[PDB]
Each structure stands twice: as C-alpha cells, then as structure tokens.
Symmetry: C2
Subunit: 162 residues, 2 copies
C-alpha cells in the first residue's frame, strides 16, 4: 500500500528533513515535494522507497546500537553512556565517511541518536547523553592521552563529558 500525503509529510518530519532536503534525496523539486504533501499529486514510488529505506536504515541502527549496548552491559553494567553527535554537516561529513552513503545528512544521524537515547531509556534503563563533538577539546584530549583520531577515541573523550 502506497504512502499518501499526510504519511509522506509525517515520514519526512520523523526524519528531521526539510521538503527541499527530501527533494534533493529523491530527485524532485521542493515544490514537487510540497505538492505531494498537500495531496496535489501522488508521490512517485521511487520517492516513497527512498524515505522508507532511510527510516529502515535508522531503525536497524537503533536496534543494532541498543543490542551492542546491552551486550557490553553484560560485562560492564554502566547506566550512563555517551553517544557522539556532530556539530555541523561539514564536520559530520569529515568525521563519518562510513555513514554518508545511507545517511548523507547530519540530521539523519542526529535522528538515529535521539531514537537510540529513547530506546536505551525504555528497554535497558540506560541513560545515553548526546554529546556534540567539540573538536578543540577533543584534539587537546587526544594530545594528552597519545590517541589517534578514531571512533573509539571520540567515545573515550565523550565519556569524560558526562
């Protein structure tokens, strides 16, 4: 069953995307997106699939991350954890080459992060703080601890920000 006007609008909003961003993602103009969100046209099936696929990707990330936290908790039962997020699109792109193909926009990663925070609270009773990467503080921390720039080093830094 195809997605209608309201559904496409609320799918978009659940992803923290603007209409223009959806246009860019689906190869349509902002006006075309607004039209289908106003029921003035039916969204092309490829456009629907693109947004559904992104939501599916985020959902997998939420489940996978929560599973990871749970498995780690079985060895180290810490109930306060950091999850690193990125302050701007530019820094997101610079630091996260492996998310860009499926989640090219920092808004998408932030959306996943919020959903992970919510899920961990509900299912694991773990408090996940969303920690914006502070590049200067992070660099200075790496220099003090002889760390190279990696996801693991970002995490280690983030943990000090709780």
């Amino acid at each position: 069953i195809g997605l209608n006007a309201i559904e496409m609008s609320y799918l978009r909003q659940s992803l923290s995307l603007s209409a223009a961003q959806v246009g860019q993602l689906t190869n349509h103009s902002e006006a075309e997106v607004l039209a289908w969100e106003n029921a003035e046209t039916q969204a092309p099936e490829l456009a629907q699939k693109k947004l559904l696929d992104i939501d599916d990707i985020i959902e997998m990330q939420v489940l996978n991350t929560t599973d990871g936290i749970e498995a780690l908790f079985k060895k180290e039962p810490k109930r306060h954890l950091a999850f690193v997020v990125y302050p701007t699109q530019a820094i997101y792109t610079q630091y996260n080459p492996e998310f860009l193909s499926s989640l090219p926009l920092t808004e998408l990663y932030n959306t996943a992060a919020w959903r992970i925070k919510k899920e961990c609270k509900l299912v694991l009773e773990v408090d996940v703080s969303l920690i914006n990467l502070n590049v200067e503080a992070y660099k200075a921390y790496r220099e003090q601890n002889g760390l190279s720039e990696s996801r693991e080093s970002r995490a280690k830094w983030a943990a000090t920000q709780l």
Copy 2:
C-alpha cells in the same frame, strides 16, 4: 542537567513541532527556543518537562491504540484500516476537546497517528492509512446514513475513503 541543546532540538523535531510552536507550548519566544537548541542557553526545566510529557502521552497512545487494533482483530477479520486525523488546528480543536489539555496541537495528534501506522505495520502486519477529516463530506455522510457525531462515526466515514 536534564536535556541538552541537541536532545531538546531532536525531541522537538520528533514531535513535528516548529521552534515557534515549542515557544507557544512552553510560554517562551521562538528566539529563546532556537537559542537553547544552539546551546547558547539552557532550556528551563518546565519547558523540558512539557515536551517530555507530550512524548510520553503519544507513546502511550501508540501502544494502547495498536493493542486495541489487535484485540479488534481477535473478534473480526484483519483488514486495511483508516485512522482519522485533523487537517487544521481549528478542525482538530472542534472535534477533540478531550485531547486539547494534553496534546494541544494537531501536529502532535498527526505524530501519534504516524507512529501508530508504523507500529501496526511492524508488530501486527496490519495496514493503517491516515485520513484527514473533511468536515463537509463527513457531515453529508452522517446525514445520509443517520449517524450522530462521534469518533466511531468519523472512523466509518474515513473507511469510505480507502
């Protein structure tokens, strides 16, 4: 403590609200909301609680509605369902006096509707389509079929749209 800038921003966006709408809900200016979302200021405790309470109310509505749909289909055959939503603030207000103190804005009810559609599909493999109330058509439908104004009557009308 409490919610930080990024957490408040993505909580807001998950509720499909503009910064101005958060301002209206929490009795602060739009500029103030944007300032806390950019970590220039801290969101007041009362503002955080308003949004978190709204999210909890929606979440309860999602679980209870989906469970209610499952029970319904223990008694009659599973079918593609319509779910009524309200296209303007005025229309939402007119038809939902009992939701207004808890979900004051129609965007919140739409958000609940979208989450219900998603949950029904994933957990029950049940298809739900969102249908905006059209006042003129609904009124004529009630007259033709001898129905009084009720949520059940709105739902019966919405099924004719599928």
